[PDB]
Amino acid sequence: IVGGYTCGANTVPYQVSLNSGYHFCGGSLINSQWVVSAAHCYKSGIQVRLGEDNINVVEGNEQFISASKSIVHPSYNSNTLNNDIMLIKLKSAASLNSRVASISLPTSCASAGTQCLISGWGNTKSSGTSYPDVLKCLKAPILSDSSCKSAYPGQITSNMFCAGYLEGGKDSCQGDSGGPVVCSGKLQGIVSWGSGCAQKNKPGVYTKVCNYVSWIKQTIASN
Ligand SMILES: [Ca+2]
């Protein structure tokens, strides 16, 4: 997250870190057994880390639970990032508590202009590299479809939305991928892509979770 703020320990209790020997992507806990992340975060060999604040210190509220299964969306296209969504099943259910909690799936799609909370352990610099240890947060508004398409001509599908600031300075970034965009208390987006981070006229692009609720529900009813 570039231009964000330190969230505060466990104030984003649905945020997970995906670890394959190191943090590599975020995700969102949607119930005690299942995480939503980005399909481009697929790796074999994922441990889900819940209850994290500093990802490099064991502070006492973590649960580390291996994945048993990962399910990339059946229509994921890694070239265009259309349908950039994946489900990860935990080998054992998390113990839900004040620091490890699920986020609701949406009923309606969020609206242009809504301010959402985006979070992660990704890079904090637009130019160069600096990875935080503690979770960072950013409030960013959803941009209109038309503004998103102008920023990325020929690249935005109906399964994507843009959020952020066309002046630059505030955005998600590498290492935030797969993490949450929460609007009105529900999971509306997944950190997916963008041209650099926090650059002018190049806002973040996010997987539009409301288009996937029926896939998510039928998949978790079956696995
Ligand atoms: Ca920790």
Side-chain angles (χ1 to χ4, degrees):
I1 302 291
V2 178
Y5 60 102
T6 295
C7 303
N10 312 117
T11 63
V12 187
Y14 52 85
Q15 170 85 52
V16 311
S17 169
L18 305 185
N19 183 287
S20 64
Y22 47 86
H23 167 81
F24 65 91
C25 271
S28 300
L29 190 66
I30 58 160
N31 62 53
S32 65
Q33 286 191 113
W34 289 94
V35 166
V36 165
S37 188
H40 84 264
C41 288
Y42 165 80
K43 281 194 184 306
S44 57
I46 293 181
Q47 185 188 62
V48 177
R49 298 189 169 206
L50 312 100
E52 287 283 17
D53 188 45
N54 190 316
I55 48 163
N56 276 314
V57 180
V58 177
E59 297 179 289
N61 294 119
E62 297 93 344
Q63 294 176 44
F64 292 179
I65 302 171
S66 290
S68 54
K69 185 180 272 189
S70 290
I71 306 172
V72 164
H73 192 274
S75 300
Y76 175 50
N77 182 322
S78 56
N79 298 329
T80 61
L81 294 186
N82 195 27
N83 310 294
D84 191 12
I85 186 170
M86 176 179 67
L87 284 163
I88 297 167
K89 191 181 188 186
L90 298 185
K91 280 180 185 245
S92 60
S95 176
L96 299 176
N97 59 40
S98 64
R99 293 179 194 256
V100 175
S102 55
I103 188 81
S104 284
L105 294 177
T107 301
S108 79
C109 299
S111 301
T114 291
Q115 286 282 355
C116 304
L117 182 69
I118 308 182
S119 46
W121 291 272
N123 189 1
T124 64
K125 299 289 205 186
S126 177
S127 291
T129 323
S130 184
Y131 288 85
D133 296 318
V134 301
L135 184 66
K136 301 291 183 164
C137 273
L138 175 61
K139 292 220 175 147
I142 297 179
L143 301 176
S144 66
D145 188 50
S146 82
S147 176
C148 189
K149 292 171 165 176
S150 286
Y152 295 110
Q155 301 161 50
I156 303 299
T157 71
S158 53
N159 299 311
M160 298 173 191
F161 65 93
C162 290
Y165 295 95
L166 296 178
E167 56 274 40
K170 291 167 274 219
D171 198 1
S172 61
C173 199
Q174 272 64 53
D176 292 321
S177 289
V181 178
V182 164
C183 316
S184 305
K186 299 198 185 160
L187 183 66
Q188 293 276 357
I190 299 165
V191 181
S192 183
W193 60 276
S195 177
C197 308
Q199 303 301 107
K200 184 172 191 208
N201 287 320
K202 287 299 167 163
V205 189
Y206 298 94
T207 307
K208 189 183 298 184
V209 174
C210 63
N211 287 356
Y212 298 101
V213 175
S214 293
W215 171 77
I216 290 169
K217 290 187 177 346
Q218 70 121 43
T219 298
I220 73 179
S222 296
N223 290 275

